[PDB]
């Protein structure tokens, strides 16, 4: 299996699925390095973020648990097609990159926070992460290039 993937069993259904311990992605189908990648992200900050402040809120007070719940809800709506990633990032990302639909541009290893970097480079082009934790908060990462 490609880097980071492992087999798992659904508790509610008993069906096998695949989970990536670098990106926290999970999916039913069997999963299918460049100098640089390009990613977008949706950041949800929490009270223990390195800077608990954003363009949405002068004082971010939500707990890490609450931020994870919000991230999980956004992932559900993206996966169902009810909402697009770019739309949720523009409206609800606590990163200033919200104004660019979450786009961060292209980057190399050694530039981003390590959990973010590792998830970004383990995604295939077009793939989306699960919740990724950094000192900034909790991220949904979309690899675009
Ligand atoms: C990564 N950080 C430093 C760079 C500035 N950021 C940004 C802000 C507003 C629009 C676009 C971007 C990057 O695409 C993101 C924060």
From Swiss-Prot:
PROSITE patterns: PPIC_PPIASE_1, PPIC_PPIASE_2, WW_DOMAIN_1, WW_DOMAIN_2. GO terms for cellular component: ciliary basal body; cytoplasm; cytosol; glutamatergic synapse; midbody; nuclear speck; nucleoplasm; nucleus. SMART domains: WW. GO terms for biological process: cellular response to hypoxia; negative regulation of amyloid-beta formation; negative regulation of cell motility; negative regulation of ERK1 and ERK2 cascade; negative regulation of protein binding; negative regulation of protein catabolic process; negative regulation of SMAD protein signal transduction; negative regulation of transforming growth factor beta receptor signaling pathway. It catalyses: [protein]-peptidylproline (omega=180) = [protein]-peptidylproline (omega=0). It is found in: Nucleus; Nucleus speckle; Cytoplasm. InterPro entries: PPIase_dom_sf, PPIase_Pin1, PPIase_PpiC, PPIase_PpiC_CS, WW_dom, WW_dom_sf. GO terms for molecular function: beta-catenin binding; cis-trans isomerase activity; cytoskeletal motor activity; GTPase activating protein binding; mitogen-activated protein kinase kinase binding; peptidyl-prolyl cis-trans isomerase activity; phosphoprotein binding; phosphoserine residue binding. The modification Phosphoserine is found at residues 53, 90. Pfam families: Rotamase, WW. Keywords: Acetylation, Cell cycle, Cytoplasm, Isomerase, Nucleus, Phosphoprotein, Rotamase. Residues 1-32 form the WW domain. The WW domain is required for the interaction with STIL and KIF20B. Peptidyl-prolyl cis/trans isomerase (PPIase) that binds to and isomerizes specific phosphorylated Ser/Thr-Pro (pSer/Thr-Pro) motifs. By inducing conformational changes in a subset of phosphorylated proteins, acts as a molecular switch in multiple cellular processes. Displays a preference for acidic residues located N-terminally to the proline bond to be isomerized. Regulates mitosis presumably by interacting with NIMA and attenuating its mitosis-promoting activity. Down-regulates kinase activity of BTK. Interacts with STIL. Interacts with KIF20B. Interacts with NEK6. Interacts (via WW domain) with PRKX. Interacts with BTK. Interacts (via PpiC domain) with DAPK1. Interacts with the phosphorylated form of RAF1. Interacts (via WW domain) with ATCAY; upon NGF stimulation. Interacts with PML (isoform PML-4). Interacts with BCL6. Interacts with FBXW7, disrupting FBXW7 dimerization and promoting FBXW7 autoubiquitination and degradation. Directly interacts with RBBP8/CtIP; this interaction depends upon RBBP8 phosphorylation. This is Peptidyl-prolyl cis-trans isomerase NIMA-interacting 1.
């Amino acid at each position: 299996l490609p880097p980071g993937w492992e087999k798992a069993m659904s508790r509610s259904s008993g069906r096998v699925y695949y989970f990536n311990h670098i990106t926290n992605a999970s999916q039913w189908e069997r999963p299918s390095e460049p100098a640089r990648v390009r990613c977008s992200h949706l950041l949800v900050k929490h009270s223990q973020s390195r800077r608990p402040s954003s363009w949405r809120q002068e004082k971010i007070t939500r707990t890490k648990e609450e931020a994870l719940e919000l991230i999980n809800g956004y992932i559900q709506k993206i996966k169902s097609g009810e909402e697009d990633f770019e739309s949720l990032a523009s409206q609800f990302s606590d990163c200033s990159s919200a104004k660019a639909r979450g786009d961060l541009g292209a980057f190399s290893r050694g530039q981003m926070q390590k959990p973010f970097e590792d998830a970004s480079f383990a995604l295939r082009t077009g793939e989306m992460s699960g919740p990724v934790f950094t000192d900034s908060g909790i991220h949904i990462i979309l690899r675009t290039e």
